Amino acid sequence: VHLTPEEKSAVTALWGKVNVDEVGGEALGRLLVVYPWTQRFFESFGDLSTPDAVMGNPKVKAHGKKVLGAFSDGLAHLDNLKGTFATLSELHCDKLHVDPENFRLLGNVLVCVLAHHFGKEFTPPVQAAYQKVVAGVANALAHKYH
Amino acid sequence: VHLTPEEKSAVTALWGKVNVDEVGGEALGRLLVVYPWTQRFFESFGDLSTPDAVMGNPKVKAHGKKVLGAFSDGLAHLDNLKGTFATLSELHCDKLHVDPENFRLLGNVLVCVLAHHFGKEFTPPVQAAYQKVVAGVANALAHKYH
Amino acid sequence: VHLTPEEKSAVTALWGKVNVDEVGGEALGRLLVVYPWTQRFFESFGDLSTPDAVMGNPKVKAHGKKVLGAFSDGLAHLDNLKGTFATLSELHCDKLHVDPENFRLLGNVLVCVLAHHFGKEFTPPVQAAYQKVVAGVANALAHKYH
Amino acid sequence: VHLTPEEKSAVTALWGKVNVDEVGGEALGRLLVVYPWTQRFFESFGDLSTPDAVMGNPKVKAHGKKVLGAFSDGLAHLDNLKGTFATLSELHCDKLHVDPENFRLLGNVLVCVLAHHFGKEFTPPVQAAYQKVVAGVANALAHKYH
Ligand code: HEM
Numbered sequence: 001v002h003l004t005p006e007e008k009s010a011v012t013a014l015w016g017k018v019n020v021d022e023v024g025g026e027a028l029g030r031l032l033v034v035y036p037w038t039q040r041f042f043e044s045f046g047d048l049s050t051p052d053a054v055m056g057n058p059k060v061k062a063h064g065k066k067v068l069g070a071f072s073d074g075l076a077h078l079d080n081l082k083g084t085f086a087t088l089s090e091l092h093c094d095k096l097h098v099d100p101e102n103f104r105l106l107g108n109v110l111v112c113v114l115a116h117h118f119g120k121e122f123t124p125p126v127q128a129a130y131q132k133v134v135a136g137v138a139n140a141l142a143h144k145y146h
Numbered sequence: 147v148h149l150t151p152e153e154k155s156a157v158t159a160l161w162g163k164v165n166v167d168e169v170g171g172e173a174l175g176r177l178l179v180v181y182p183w184t185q186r187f188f189e190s191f192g193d194l195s196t197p198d199a200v201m202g203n204p205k206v207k208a209h210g211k212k213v214l215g216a217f218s219d220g221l222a223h224l225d226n227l228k229g230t231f232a233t234l235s236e237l238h239c240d241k242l243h244v245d246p247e248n249f250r251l252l253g254n255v256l257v258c259v260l261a262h263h264f265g266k267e268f269t270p271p272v273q274a275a276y277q278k279v280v281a282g283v284a285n286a287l288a289h290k291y292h
Numbered sequence: 293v294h295l296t297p298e299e300k301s302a303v304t305a306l307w308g309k310v311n312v313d314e315v316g317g318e319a320l321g322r323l324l325v326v327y328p329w330t331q332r333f334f335e336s337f338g339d340l341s342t343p344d345a346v347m348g349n350p351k352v353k354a355h356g357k358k359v360l361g362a363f364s365d366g367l368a369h370l371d372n373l374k375g376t377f378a379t380l381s382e383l384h385c386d387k388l389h390v391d392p393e394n395f396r397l398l399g400n401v402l403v404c405v406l407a408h409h410f411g412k413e414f415t416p417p418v419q420a421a422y423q424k425v426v427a428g429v430a431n432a433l434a435h436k437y438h
Numbered sequence: 439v440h441l442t443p444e445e446k447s448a449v450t451a452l453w454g455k456v457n458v459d460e461v462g463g464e465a466l467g468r469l470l471v472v473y474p475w476t477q478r479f480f481e482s483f484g485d486l487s488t489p490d491a492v493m494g495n496p497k498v499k500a501h502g503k504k505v506l507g508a509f510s511d512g513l514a515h516l517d518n519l520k521g522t523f524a525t526l527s528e529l530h531c532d533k534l535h536v537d538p539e540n541f542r543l544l545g546n547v548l549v550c551v552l553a554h555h556f557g558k559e560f561t562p563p564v565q566a567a568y569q570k571v572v573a574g575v576a577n578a579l580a581h582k583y584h
């Protein structure tokens with residue numbers, strides 16, 4: 001992932017203001033609502049019938065916080081995402097068999113959640129920076145398939 | 147596209163509140179900035195070299211407004227997206243030769259712009275409905291390749 | 293799907309030379325080997341651990357011929373794919389939750405299988421026509437998501 | 439790209455029987471026929487009006503030879519695709535603005551041309567190996583967008 005310092009500044013500044021405990025659950029929950037086939041991976045989480053059921057699921061919220069945590073991790077090592085994510089790649093690919101396209105969709109939902117939250121501060125160049133990051137993390141997660 | 151009563155009422159309500167000037171140049175600008183290869187289609191527009199040049203450009207802004215106008219038309223005929231978009235399909239496909247994937251990328255940018263432009267009212271079910279709409283439009287636009 | 297009369301004639305002539313009992317198993321099996329996350333959907337098939345575990349799997353072979361039968365249906369009803377695949381769309385979308393991208397991969401694998409089998413009779417325009425067909429089928433199977 | 443030695447050997451062994459002078463032109467030509475929007479990049483090659491026109495084009499055949507030449511380089515340097523394709527990445531991204539999805543499509547057409555050529559030598563594990571190589575080359579080519 002190649003970010004200019006201006007880009008690195010703007011991404012981290014935005015990041016610093018993310019409600020980590022909420023954003024994660026919102027991004028995971030919206031993934032399940034918007035791209036419904038993804039619910040197949042989380043059937044053990046309980047009731048996912050309605051959007052309300054999904055958005056209200058505390059297992060979804062809890063897990064969402066864990067996803068956001070790893071995201072914060074890659075953000076700290078843009079230099080080496082493959083290695084940062086090596087362990088999560090074996091899990092998601094070798095054990096869970098998640099389609100590589102799903103990693104890209106979660107990336108997308110995340111960018112949407114930020115736009116939604118940071119309105120005007122989510123500028124075109126900031127959107128561009130985050131797009132490159134979510135793409136970099138998605139590619140690092142599908143590494144086991146490469 | 148298949149929208150549930152709720153989704154459709156939902157959809158058409160928010161649309162009515164859309165500031166096309168704001169959303170159109172924003173959607174079009176963000177496409178050229180986030181996915182740079184898209185600039186080659188708009189060489190006739192001038193200075194697109196920087197996010198500022200792009201976001202500044204009134205050609206971009208005016209064209210953006212035209213794109214939303216076609217969207218609106220589309221929104222009125224969710225029943226016949228294909229027929230609604232026939233002439234634009236011929237233009238984009240047969241004449242311009244735009245990659246069908248780019249119709250998906252504009253759609254996604256547009257969704258991020260609505261999140262951005264409706265904050266709190268852009269709930270998971272609304273995003274889910276708008277995602278079906280944009281995918282529907284992208285598919286109707288790529289119709290000539292099918 | 294829009295085929296010119298020359299496309300329709302060549303597509304239908306080639307299809308009549310296909311050994312159904314065989315190409316369907318070959319296409320489903322290659323899908324499972326080349327895009328390994330797809331194995332997660334074939335819950336009762338047993339060992340899918342090695343290419344030979346997959347390719348000679350009796351259930352893969354039997355199942356491939358049912359897939360092939362459905363494709364034939366498709367080809368015979370290009371004017372009505374959504375209707376033709378109505379119950380298969382609800383099974384795959386509503387019940388099985390197959391990601392739409394997967395429908396596309398299987399179409400791509402089938403095309404490769406025909407190339408492998410027909411060699412030189414698989415000309416560029418025949419390939420282009422088959423591409424439009426498999427894309428139309430994938431689109432009709434993902435109907436319930438639209 | 440992760441290839442087992444078994445895969446590596448099956449891959450290089452087959453590459454050795456490729457008609458260097460022909461497969462390239464076939465691949466490129468089928469790209470232009472099957473995904474017609476790619477014709478916009480080769481409008482200076484002359485007449486691409488028809489499949490026959492495309493497949494006939496001597497510019498296409500000559501250019502296919504160079505493409506295949508680049509592929510052999512990648513094959514010879516699986517451990518250094520990014521360096522191997524450094525200059526080609528700057529040409530295609532920075533200079534030509536080719537959409538990254540098109541690199542993917544070319545790799546896919548190539549695999550189909552190999553299938554079409556090798557019949558039976560093109561077994562499921564060989565196809566899987568080739569799919570990982572093409573994906574790795576497409577990703578290396580798109581590096582400038584990352
Ligand atoms: C691309 C961004 C993603 C990140 C950063 C991420 C991160 C994580 C993390 C941190 C965990 C918990 C690891 C542990 O408990 O050791 C996890 C587990 C899991 N993830 Fe993801 N993930 C991503 C994408 C996805 C996608 C797209 C899906 C499926 C649609 C998915 C499905 C799962 C599942 C099923 C589990 C296991 C949860 C359980 O049963 O405890 N992940 N992921």
Ligand code: HEM
Binds near residue numbers: 234244253
């Ligand atoms: C969401 C899908 C899209 C819609 C609804 C749309 C709509 C339109 C409209 C309404 C026009 C004006 C045609 C006229 O009145 O003469 C137009 C033209 C054009 N579109 Fe799009 N468009 C879409 C996607 C795209 C994409 C993805 C690209 C390229 C990346 C693109 C490139 C162009 C170009 C180059 C023109 C011609 C501009 C000129 O020189 O006049 N469009 N489009």
Ligand code: HEM
Binds near residue numbers: 336359398433
């Ligand atoms: C390209 C289009 C496809 C066609 C025409 C097709 C066709 C079929 C047909 C005819 C059946 C049997 C329905 C019945 O029970 O009567 C079936 C079942 C099934 N398909 Fe597909 N399919 C397609 C793609 C896929 C893909 C991409 C996946 C997953 C990767 C998939 C997974 C399944 C599963 C898991 C079943 C049920 C098998 C069982 O009986 O356990 N299908 N499909």
Ligand code: HEM
Binds near residue numbers: 480
């Ligand atoms: C993905 C694998 C690809 C490889 C290995 C590849 C390789 C090459 C090579 C070796 C050249 C000659 C560069 C030089 O020495 O001037 C070239 C040029 C070119 N390629 Fe590609 N290419 C690939 C994909 C594509 C795609 C998908 C497109 C567009 C659809 C494309 C469009 C072009 C164009 C327009 C040129 C310039 C032709 C000229 O004027 O010489 N390339 N490519």
